[PDB]
Amino acid sequence: QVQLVQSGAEVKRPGSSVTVSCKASGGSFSTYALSWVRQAPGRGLEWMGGVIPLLTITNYAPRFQGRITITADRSTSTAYLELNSLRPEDTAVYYCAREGTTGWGWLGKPIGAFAHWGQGTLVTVSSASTKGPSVFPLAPSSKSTSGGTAALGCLVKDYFPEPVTVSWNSGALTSGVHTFPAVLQSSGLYSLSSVVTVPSSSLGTQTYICNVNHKPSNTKVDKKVEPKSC
């Protein structure tokens, strides 16, 4: 089975250049088409270009023609996507995809469709600097329905870049947990909200701690949420 392994996530400033790698293992490398497809957050798939390594023939999408460079290195069985003049709208997940075949090696028969995909590579282009988030408590209302259901949570605000992972009570609390997709604020920093609904009866006794983890900034914050003493 063909397997594609891409390079790690990238954080770049506007105007710079990035190079994402796609190392192929298993199957044959030279005779099958290797394409690159990007996908902006919450958007669809977009074909950027492709290359047949053994032919040294690359085909680019008109939208990227001039700014993009796709290469194939047969000595390392590794394809490369190079994107220059980066702008904030280039922020996306870049996938490398290879067409499938019916058989093995060079006399394998190509099907054209992208049957094999890489794990994807997050490329974030911004003027913002890498920052750990500030985690504020979304405290449970002091008007929570007695003997009913109350909602509480944590606001993970002003961080860069994506992603952030949030758990509750170190993974012990999973029922009723909603970690929302992050929004990109006008300041250039990300922010998301993670809530959970619990019995109101538990509000005065049970400890609720959200565990916020931001790998890109090496940040780890455990925040305790409790009713406001009003």
Ligand X SMILES: CCCCCC(=O)OC[C@H](COP(=O)(O)O)OC(=O)CCCCC
Specify whether the CB–CB gap between 45 and 24 falls below 8 A. Answer: no
230 is a site residue for other proteins (CB under 8 A): yes
Nearer to other proteins, 17 or 142 (CB): 142
114 is a site residue for other proteins (CB under 8 A): yes
Whole-angstrom distance, CA of residue 7 vs CA of residue 78 = 11
103 is a site residue for ligand X (CB under 6 A): no
Q: Which two tokens stand for residue 67?
A: 């700014």
Nearer to ligand X, 103 or 112 (CB): 103
40 is a site residue for other proteins (CB under 8 A): no
Q: Which two tokens stand for residue 127?
A: 């003027």
121 is a site residue for other proteins (CB under 8 A): no
Which one among 76, 112, 165, 201 touches other proteins, defined by CB under 8 A?
112
Which one among 21, 29, 190, 198 touches ligand X, defined by CB under 6 A?
29
54 is a site residue for other proteins (CB under 8 A): no
Whole-angstrom distance, CA of residue 78 vs CA of residue 71 = 9
Q: Give the nearest residue (CB) to ligand X.
A: 105
Count of residues that bind ligand X according to CB under 6 A: 8
134 is a site residue for ligand X (CB under 6 A): no
77 is a site residue for ligand X (CB under 6 A): yes
* Binding footprint of other proteins on the chain (CB under 8 A): 35, 37, 44-47, 50, 59, 61-62, 95, 97, 100, 111-115, 117-120, 134, 136-139, 141, 149, 151, 153, 155, 157, 178-183, 185, 191-193, 195, 197, 230
Which residues of this protein are in contact with ligand X, per CB under 6 A?
A: 28-30, 74, 77, 105-107
